[PDB]
């Protein structure tokens, strides 16, 4: 119950205006930082991701690669390079001002190839921004989210033997949603998917 510890902590501490440094503090002291980096192998070849492997981006047109097994031939999805069958980690994103982006986590186990709808049933739990202003959750239907302000930075959080992913807003430490109590029985990858064209890249904060 951590996750949903953390959840409470920062309504608790938004009542003294210490959320952030609250943030800031237990997820450094709790959580092991990943240090994702985007595995180009997987990536959808309309997507570009970048020199140092921090960041996606959208090609107007695919580029042509091998059809490799490990690739999705079909969702604009790209994956970290490694994956997490147990313990705590969290990383952070740059969203910026894109208009439409969701990331998550995903099972080792998805389907590559073709189409499955991103929901946990199929092994994603993700959500993101769609739309400019819609704000939701990939689950099976999806649920919209009321934010008080939009997130320029996310902290994706995994806690493995509770079964919990958790989305802050990183700048503020303001919680956006929790998955609780997921039974999880694959290895685990970060997962980042971009439709749109857009000026602002998708990238990883290092840690
Ligand atoms: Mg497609």
């Known amino acids: 119950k951590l996750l949903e510890e953390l959840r409470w902590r920062s309504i608790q501490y938004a009542s003294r205006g ?27 070849p309309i997507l570009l991701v970048s020199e140092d492997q921090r960041s996606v981006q959208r090609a107007k047109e695919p580029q042509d690669l091998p059809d490799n097994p490990e690739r999705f031939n079909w969702h604009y999805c790209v994956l970290g390079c490694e994956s997490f069958i147990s313990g705590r980690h969290y990383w952070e994103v740059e969203v910026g001002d ?29 959500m993101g ?22 997130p320029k930075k996310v902290g994706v959080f995994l806690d493995y033997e509770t079964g919990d992913i958790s989305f802050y807003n990183a700048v503020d430490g303001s919680h956006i949603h929790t998955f609780l109590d997921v039974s999880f029985s694959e290895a685990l990858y970060p997962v980042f998917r971009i439709l749109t064209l857009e000026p602002t890249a998708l990238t990883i904060c290092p840690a």
């Open 18 to 44: 210490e959320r952030h440094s609250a943030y800031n503090e237990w997820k450094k002291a709790l959580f092991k930082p990943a240090d994702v980096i985007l595995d180009p192998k997987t990536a959808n």
């Open 98 to 126: 894109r208009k439409e982006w969701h990331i998550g986590v995903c099972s080792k186990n998805v389907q590559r190839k073709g189409w499955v709808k991103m929901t946990p049933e199929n092994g994603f739990w993700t």
């Open 129 to 150: 921004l769609t739309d400019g202003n819609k704000y939701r959750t990939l689950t099976e239907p999806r649920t919209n989210l009321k934010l008080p302000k939009p």
